[PDB]
Design an enzyme around this catalytic site. Structure first.
Site, PDB file in Angstrom:
ATOM      1  N   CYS A 111      35.977  45.228  36.771  1.00 36.17           N
ATOM      2  CA  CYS A 111      35.903  44.248  37.375  1.00 36.17           C
ATOM      3  C   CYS A 111      37.541  44.496  37.151  1.00 36.17           C
ATOM      4  CB  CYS A 111      35.089  43.558  37.034  1.00 36.17           C
ATOM      5  SG  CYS A 111      35.224  41.663  38.458  1.00 36.17           S
ATOM      6  N   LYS A 162      20.986  41.890  37.769  1.00 35.87           N
ATOM      7  CA  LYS A 162      21.670  40.799  37.535  1.00 35.87           C
ATOM      8  C   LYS A 162      20.435  40.185  36.492  1.00 35.87           C
ATOM      9  CE  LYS A 162      24.961  39.922  40.447  1.00 35.87           C
ATOM     10  NZ  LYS A 162      25.972  38.683  41.444  1.00 35.87           N
ATOM     11  N   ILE A 212      31.255  37.339  38.545  1.00 32.09           N
ATOM     12  CA  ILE A 212      31.992  37.259  37.376  1.00 32.09           C
ATOM     13  C   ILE A 212      33.297  37.382  37.768  1.00 32.09           C
ATOM     14  CG2 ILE A 212      30.551  38.367  35.817  1.00 32.09           C
ATOM     15  CD1 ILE A 212      32.433  41.067  36.204  1.00 32.09           C
ATOM     16  N   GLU A 236      36.390  31.113  39.035  1.00 27.53           N
ATOM     17  CA  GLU A 236      37.028  31.700  40.139  1.00 27.53           C
ATOM     18  C   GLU A 236      38.180  32.545  38.683  1.00 27.53           C
ATOM     19  OE1 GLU A 236      38.468  32.250  43.305  1.00 27.53           O
ATOM     20  OE2 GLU A 236      40.344  32.566  42.190  1.00 27.53           O
ATOM     21  N   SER A 237      38.668  33.656  38.979  1.00 25.87           N
ATOM     22  CA  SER A 237      38.751  34.075  38.168  1.00 25.87           C
ATOM     23  C   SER A 237      40.834  33.618  38.332  1.00 25.87           C
ATOM     24  CB  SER A 237      39.862  35.575  38.253  1.00 25.87           C
ATOM     25  OG  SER A 237      40.382  35.641  39.708  1.00 25.87           O
TER      26      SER A 237
HETATM   27  S1  GSH Z   1      34.915  42.662  40.205  1.00 22.98           S
HETATM   28  C1  GSH Z   1      32.897  41.578  40.396  1.00 22.98           C
HETATM   29  C2  GSH Z   1      32.885  40.734  41.372  1.00 22.98           C
HETATM   30  N1  GSH Z   1      33.814  39.456  41.258  1.00 22.98           N
HETATM   31  C3  GSH Z   1      34.248  38.721  42.419  1.00 22.98           C
HETATM   32  O1  GSH Z   1      34.487  39.024  43.414  1.00 22.98           O
HETATM   33  C4  GSH Z   1      35.100  37.325  41.950  1.00 22.98           C
HETATM   34  C5  GSH Z   1      36.471  37.087  42.799  1.00 22.98           C
HETATM   35  C6  GSH Z   1      36.466  35.896  42.814  1.00 22.98           C
HETATM   36  N2  GSH Z   1      37.463  34.966  44.208  1.00 22.98           N
HETATM   37  C7  GSH Z   1      37.759  35.369  41.896  1.00 22.98           C
HETATM   38  O2  GSH Z   1      37.335  35.228  40.379  1.00 22.98           O
HETATM   39  O3  GSH Z   1      38.744  35.346  42.007  1.00 22.98           O
HETATM   40  C8  GSH Z   1      31.441  39.721  41.580  1.00 22.98           C
HETATM   41  O4  GSH Z   1      31.354  38.855  40.827  1.00 22.98           O
HETATM   42  N3  GSH Z   1      30.839  40.595  42.285  1.00 22.98           N
HETATM   43  C9  GSH Z   1      28.846  40.233  41.983  1.00 22.98           C
HETATM   44  C10 GSH Z   1      28.236  39.834  43.601  1.00 22.98           C
HETATM   45  O5  GSH Z   1      27.133  40.052  43.376  1.00 22.98           O
HETATM   46  O6  GSH Z   1      28.924  39.598  43.796  1.00 22.98           O
END
Ligand code: GSH
Ligand code: GSH
Lengths: 238, 238
Positions: free
Chosen positions: A31, A58, A71, A84-85
Site C-alpha cells: 500500500c 479483513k 489503511i 488519512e495518511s
Molecule cells: S493502499 C490501501 C487503501 N488505502 C487507501 O486508499 C487510503 C487512502 C487515504 N486517502 C489516505 O490514507 O491518504 C485501502 O485502505 N484499501 C482498502 C479498502 O477497502 O479500500
C-alpha cells in the site's frame, strides 16, 4: 524495514493494546498510502509497531479501527485512532521530538501542502495506468495524462532549482510523494518520466536517502504480488 | 463584513502591492470556500483587505495569483501566494498571534482535520441539490445522500455530547464547516437537517458567535444572486 509479517485477516487474533511508549500503524506491505506513513515513522526515528492487514478478507475487529477498514491507521497507547495518511504523517511530525520534517516557517509549510495538492491526481492515475497495462490495453491516453501531471511537478523543481521539492535537502513533502515514484518501474510506467529531468534526478537522490533506501520494496516480491493481485488470488494479501 | 465592493473582472486595474502589515484575500461575496477563510481572518482579528473577483469574466492578471483563477487566494506583503481555502486557513492560524483556532494538542488538532474529511462530500452535494431544485427536478435522491452525510456529522456531536465539533466552545473546525450550513435555507434544503437535532443546535449556536454573525449574508441579496446566476446573467458576478 519492520513490516515483514503476515497480514491479519478474518478470524485473526486482534493485537494487544498498544504498549506505553509505542505507536502502532496498521499497514499492508504494498500500500502506497501506508508506505508514506512508514517513511515518516522511520525518518523521525519513532518507536513503532507495524501490523499488516489483509485487505481482501479483513478482520471483523479491524472495522473498530477504521469504519470502512481503510489503511493506514495510527493507534496510540491511549486508545486514540488517527487516519488519512496525510493527517497521520502530520500528527507524527508535530507529536514527536527530534528531526522536524515539515518546515518551521508557516509559509514554507503551507507551500509543501500546496505541492501536495498539485500531486493529488497522480495516485489514481498511476493506478489506472497499471490496471490498463495489466489487461493489455493501449494505455496511451492515461500515460499522456500522467506525463502532464509529472510536467507540472518538474516545473516546480525547475523553478526552485533545488534537488528536493522543499529545498536543498529532503523534507516532509518528499516523503509524501515518494511511494508512487518508487512504483513506476514495476508498474511499467517509468517511461512517463523520460521527459522530466529534475524529477529523474530527484528519484536518484531519494533512493540515496537513508530512510527511503531502508524501506525500498523488493522488486521481484512486488511483481509476484501484482500477478497474484490481478488474478484475485488470496495469496496476494498474505 | 468588509467585502462589500464591486468585483474586478476583465479589463480591471489590478490592485497595488499588498502594504506591509496587511494580508490580502481574493474572494467573491457568494463563494463558500472564500467565506471559510474570511471567517478565520475575522475570528483571528487579522488586519486584511478583501478583493472581490468576477468569476464569469476573470481579470487576465488574476491568473498570476492562481493558475486557474480559483479563489480564495491569500497574498502577503512579501509577494507570497497561498491557496486552497483549508491551507489558507491553517496558514493564517499558525502565522498570526492572539486567539488560536486549531487546538494545541497534536491529537485534537488531527481529530479536527479528520472531521474535516468526514465533511468532504457535503459541499458538492449541497451544490448538486441547489442545481437540481433550480431546474425543477424531484431531487429526492440527492437530498437523501445529503441527509446521510449530515447523519454522519450528527453522530460526532452526539458521541462527544458537546455543542461544537471541537468541544464546548467554537474553534477552527466549526468555521471550516460553517458556510455550507448558512446556505441551507436559501438553497432550499434546510429540511435536510430536520432529523439531526445536535446539528440544529449547532446551527443556532454558530449564529450567536460574534464572527459568524458579523459575516452573515443578507438573504434577499443572496436570492437575487442565485436568480441572476442561474440565468447566466453577468450582473450576478458584480
Ligand atoms: S493502499 C490501501 C487503501 N488505502 C487507501 O486508499 C487510503 C487512502 C487515504 N486517502 C489516505 O490514507 O491518504 C485501502 O485502505 N484499501 C482498502 C479498502 O477497502 O479500500
Ligand atoms: S466559490 C468559487 C470557486 N472556489 C473553489 O471551488 C475553491 C475550492 C478549493 N478546493 C478550496 O479553496 O478549498 C472558484 O474558485 N471558482 C472559479 C472557477 O473557475 O473554478
Amino acid at each position: 524495514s519492520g513490516d515483514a509479517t503476515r497480514t491479519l485477516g478474518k478470524g485473526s487474533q486482534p493485537p494487544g493494546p498498544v504498549p506505553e511508549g509505542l505507536i502502532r500503524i496498521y499497514s499492508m506491505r504494498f500500500c502506497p498510502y501506508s508506505h508514506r506513513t512508514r517513511l515518516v515513522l522511520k525518518a523521525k526515528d519513532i518507536r513503532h509497531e507495524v501490523v499488516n492487514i489483509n485487505l481482501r478478507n479483513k478482520p471483523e475487529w479491524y472495522y473498530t479501527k477504521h469504519p470502512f477498514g481503510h489503511i493506514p491507521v495510527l493507534e496510540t497507547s491511549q486508545s486514540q485512532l488517527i487516519y488519512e495518511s496525510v493527517i497521520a504523517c502530520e500528527y507524527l511530525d508535530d507529536a514527536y521530538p527530534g528531526r522536524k520534517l515539515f518546515p518551521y516557517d508557516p509559509y514554507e509549510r503551507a507551500r509543501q501542502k500546496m505541492l501536495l495538492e498539485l500531486f493529488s491526481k497522480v495516485p489514481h492515475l498511476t493506478k489506472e495506468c497499471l490496471v490498463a497495462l495489466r489487461s493489455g490495453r493501449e494505455s496511451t491516453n492515461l500515460k499522456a495524462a500522467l506525463r502532464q501531471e509529472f510536467s507540472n511537478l518538474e516545473e516546480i523543481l525547475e523553478y526552485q532549482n533545488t534537488t528536493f521539492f522543499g529545498g536543498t535537502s529532503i523534507s516532509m513533502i518528499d516523503y509524501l510523494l515518494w511511494p508512487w515514484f518508487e512504483r513506476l518501474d514495476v508498474y511499467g510506467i517509468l517511461d512517463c518520466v523520460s521527459h522530466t529531468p529534475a524529477l529523474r534526478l530527484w528519484i536518484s537522490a531519494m533512493k540515496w536517502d537513508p530512510t527511503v533506501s531502508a524501506l525500498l520494496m523488493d522488486k521481484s516480491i512486488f511483481q509476484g504480488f501484482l500477478n497474484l493481485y490481478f488474478q484475485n488470488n488470496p495469496n496476494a494479501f498474505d
